[PDB]
Every structure is written in C-alpha cells, then in structure tokens.
Write an enzyme that holds these catalytic residues in place. Sequence first.
Site, short mmCIF file in Angstrom:
data_model
loop_
_atom_site.label_atom_id
_atom_site.label_comp_id
_atom_site.label_asym_id
_atom_site.label_seq_id
_atom_site.Cartn_x
_atom_site.Cartn_y
_atom_site.Cartn_z
N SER A 48 0.82 -1.20 0.00
CA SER A 48 0.00 0.00 0.00
C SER A 48 0.85 1.24 0.00
CB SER A 48 -0.95 0.06 1.22
OG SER A 48 -0.36 0.81 2.25
N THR A 150 13.55 -1.59 -4.01
CA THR A 150 14.42 -2.75 -4.09
C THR A 150 14.59 -3.37 -2.75
OG1 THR A 150 15.61 -1.78 -5.92
CG2 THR A 150 16.76 -3.51 -4.78
N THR A 168 12.84 -6.08 -7.62
CA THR A 168 12.20 -4.75 -7.73
C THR A 168 11.12 -4.79 -8.76
OG1 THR A 168 12.63 -2.35 -7.94
CG2 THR A 168 13.68 -3.84 -9.61
N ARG A 178 11.74 -3.55 -20.57
CA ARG A 178 13.06 -3.08 -20.01
C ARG A 178 13.47 -4.00 -18.85
NH1 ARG A 178 14.76 -1.27 -14.76
NH2 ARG A 178 16.61 0.14 -14.97
N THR A 201 21.64 -1.31 -5.56
CA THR A 201 20.41 -0.55 -5.82
C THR A 201 20.91 0.73 -6.53
OG1 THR A 201 18.41 0.44 -4.85
CG2 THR A 201 20.44 0.56 -3.55
N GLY A 202 20.03 1.32 -7.33
CA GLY A 202 20.35 2.51 -8.08
C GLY A 202 19.95 2.32 -9.50
N1 LIG Z 1 18.03 -1.13 -9.65
C1 LIG Z 1 16.64 -0.88 -9.96
C2 LIG Z 1 16.17 0.43 -9.39
C3 LIG Z 1 16.30 0.46 -7.92
O1 LIG Z 1 17.30 0.17 -7.30
N2 LIG Z 1 15.22 0.85 -7.32
O2 LIG Z 1 15.25 0.92 -5.94
C4 LIG Z 1 16.48 -0.83 -11.45
O3 LIG Z 1 17.34 -0.27 -12.22
O4 LIG Z 1 15.49 -1.40 -11.88
#
Ligand SMILES: N[C@@H](CC(=O)NO)C(=O)O
Lengths: 293, 271
Positions: A48, A150, A168, A178, A201-202
Amino acid sequence: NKPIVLSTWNFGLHANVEAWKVLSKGGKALDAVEKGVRLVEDDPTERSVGYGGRPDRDGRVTLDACIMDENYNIGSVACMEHIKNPISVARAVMEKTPHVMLVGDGALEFALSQGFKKENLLTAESEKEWKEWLKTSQYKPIVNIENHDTIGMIALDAQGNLSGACTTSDMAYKMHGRVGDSPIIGAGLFVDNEIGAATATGHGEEVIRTVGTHLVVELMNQGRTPQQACKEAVERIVKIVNRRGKNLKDIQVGFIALNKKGEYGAYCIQDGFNFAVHDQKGNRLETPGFALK
Amino acid sequence: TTNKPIVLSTWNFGLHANVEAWKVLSKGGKALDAVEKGVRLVEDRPDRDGRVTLDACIMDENYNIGSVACMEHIKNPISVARAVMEKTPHVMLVGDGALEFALSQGFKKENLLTAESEKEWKEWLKTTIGMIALDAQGNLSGACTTSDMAYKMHGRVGDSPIIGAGLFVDNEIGAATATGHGEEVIRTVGTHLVVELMNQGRTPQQACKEAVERIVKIVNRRGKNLKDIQVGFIALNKKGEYGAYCIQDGFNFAVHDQKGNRLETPGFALK
Ligand SMILES: N[C@@H](CC(=O)NO)C(=O)O
C-alpha cells in the site's frame, strides 16, 4: 561474525526481521533471504505504500528478481507480470528447471505451472499516477530515500554460508520489456561462498554496464574489506560516468557487501542511500559514505 | 608494438564473419561497425512452443551497451541491440517490448521459422557467435548473437544478451566473449571475470585460462562432471594480444589481423 543479514533500504530493515528469525534459528541463508523478501511482498501495508507496485509506461507492473545460494545455484525472472512473489518464482527457476533466467510470458507461464496465482499488482493510485505521467511521458528515473523499490539482501548463516536475493518493480515508466540489474547475476547480485556477496540498488543500467556486484566481490577477492570494495566499485562507476560525458548527479548507485567472515560494508555515489544490518546486537539502519560530495 | 586492427570470433564460421568485419577494419573503420557487420553475417531451432526467439548484445569502446533477449520476428537482433544502446535510456529490452521497439525503429517484422525448422520442431515434440575487435584507432568493441533456442522453455535466456556473461569490453583493459553452456557462463559472470584478470595483469591467454580454471573449481564444488560443462573464452587486450581457453577440446576460433584471417585452436583444461 554470524549469522548476519544485510539489505537495501527501509524495505530491507523490514525484511531483516523475518530473515533474522530464520537465521537465529540456525536456518539456511537461502531460506532466510527468500523468507525476508516474502514478508515484504506479502505485507499489505508495504504494498500500500508502493512496494512492488511500479508500472512500466504501458501501465504494466513488471518484476525483475534473482536469487543466489552458497554454491552458485541461481534463479532469475525478468519482466514478469501478475505474480506477487517473484523471488519465490526465481527460486523455482533455480530449483526446478535447468535454466537460470526466464523472461516475459514464459516466466509468468512457468510461475502459473508452479502454482503461483495471477493477481493485479496495479493499485488505483499507481494507475492514476501513471495516467498523469502519460500526459508528458517524461522519463526521469530517480532512486533515493523517497523513491525506491528494491530489496537486495545478502546473508551469512550459522554454517558460514552466504546467499542473496534482489528484486524490484523499478523503474516506474520504463519502456515495456526493459530489464534492470536486479535479475542479472553479477549486476544486482553476486554471491561466491569462498569470498563474499554483494547486492546493489540505483540506476540499473549503470550497475549492468559495470557488472557492479561481481566487481565488488572480485575486489574482496583482491584483498579489499567489504566497505573498501564497495567504495572502489563506486569509484569505478564514477570514472565511467565521466568518460561517458554524463553528469553524476543523474546517477545513484549503492552497494552493500558481506565477506565470509561476516564483516560488512557499503558505499554509494550519492548521499541518500541507506541499508539495514541485523546481527546479534539487533537490526539497524545505517547510512554509508558516498562519492559525490 | 601494438597489433591492430584485429578481430576475433567464436567457432569455425567466425572465419567468414571476420571477413565482413575486416572490410570495415581494414579501411580504418570503427570496431563497433566491424563487430556489428560481422555478426550480421551470421544473422543473414525454436523454443519448445515453436517460436523463434533471438538474443544479442553489443558493447562499444566507451561502456555503451545494448541488448535484446527472447525477441521474435526480427532477423537482425544485433542491430536492434545497437538501437537499444543508442536510441533508448535502457540497456536491455526483452520479449514483446523488444519487438515493439524494433518496429518503431523501422526493422521489418518477418517470419523466422523456416519450413523445415517448423517440421523438425513438430518431430521433436513427438520424440551463435561472439566477436571482439580492436580498430586502427586502438579502440575495442564486441557483439554477440544467438538464434538457437534448442527447444528450451519459452522465455529462457542464455548468456549472449547478458553483459559480463557472454560479452564484456573495457577500453582501458580488453574485451572477452564466451562460448558454451549459457547457464554456466551466466552463473560465473565469465567475460567480466576474464577482463578483470587482464586488469590484474594477465595476458589475454593467461586470463582466459585462469578464468576457465576458476570455473573448473566451481563446477567441482557443484558436484557436476566437467564432461557435461563446456565454457570457453576468447579475449583481446589493448595491445592486440589475444588468447582463448576452454574447459574441453573441440572449440576453435577465428582471428584476422594483418597476417590474415585464420583458425586457431586454444588450450583446454579437461585432459
Ligand atoms: N536497480 C533498480 C532500481 C532500484 O534500485 N530501485 O530501488 C532498477 O534499475 O530497476
């Protein structure tokens, strides 16, 4: 020392509680990461607030996930729709097929054949926001404290085995089909039981381009502490961004790592990344250092 | 003494792809065009549901990458992968979305299942190239492409479209491309491993062999028999030194520099 579990963001702090219950009971690192992630997938309060809920630009929630055990067994799914528990499906790819990655329809078909159920993952609000973003279709992917999705989680169990998981629905409004780093072994996750593990993450493209987690782990293999390894990986990404004529403010990359001794560390391009570490002293949110001062 | 330009590619039929790359490289052209044209040649069986799905990726001299996986109806996936890299904010597209993109860039939608592939699939129901080059300016690039799904599950992805698995290129270090079982290249992040070993001071030969030797150790720890696992690499560094190594025998590669195009047989670990 050990057991110890580390994970990305607030979602990881939450997942850590379940992971820790498995670990503190002597459970397998692999169950603990699966079980920690599932705790957040299945928590309706987390869903949520947006967990696992981002749609691509066609309004489709498509999930990337992978999991890796202490002996190079891997499973992954990418661009999977309609299934809420993608880590579990990734675990099934690993355990029940001779493949390591399924995508698209095929990953859903396989999920369905393993008993997972079709649900709609698109909340009304997310649908609304999607309809609104579609008025200008300005793709501006962002990853920070207010905007992320993530769980990357890596854990060392009582037997001294590593495992990990990454998952994620990001990035919101990505082109349909994608794939980010989250399901790609060596990008969003890598675990080698002889050295250590790392997750990330990123902006996934950047993680994929630098094979980030593999690099972090190879840096632990070459004598770096986990923190030093994450720092050096990030510093590699910073050089590459520059060689590419890009602006580093547009790019967030965060790594966390665990070596085989249970020592841990973390580093990121920009301020605005946090991780969660649960060892015997408890569950803590920590904020590592960053390269863009 | 740099040896450039130079192109290498996997398997016997690399000889022919090399001739197409060389048309580009011998005229001082970009590595990136050379590998693209080279694997296009190879492009000019389905999954178990009778669907022809293709995978490709491409990496240039400046960390640009593009990749398509499990894409249907487009003959030249390497060129769509190149479109992903150059025309999108993403590095990988799969499935229906890869196709929808291909169509928006003007690729022609076509039927890829031949008369005889269709009938061989119905039959079964009842019962690939990587290329790396160094151009005259001293820049690297790489491409690979695969079209044999070998009746695997719909949506299965091997190593060809995964950066660091089937293909990795760092312009300050070198390039590697992989051969053999996709699942094993993926699990070991093989080509990234090869290139980091070159970054750790190994020649291309030594990096390929040490990569393979680490992977033999992994296969051992997994309780599998080496005879069931084929993995191999070809690699190129910034001086045009090259090499190649595999778990088992019988893989060759093609190499073209100013000494000509030729087939070579690398070393292998399984004695
Ligand atoms: N690494 C993921 C994005 C991410 O870290 N979101 O928190 C992405 O490129 O799909």
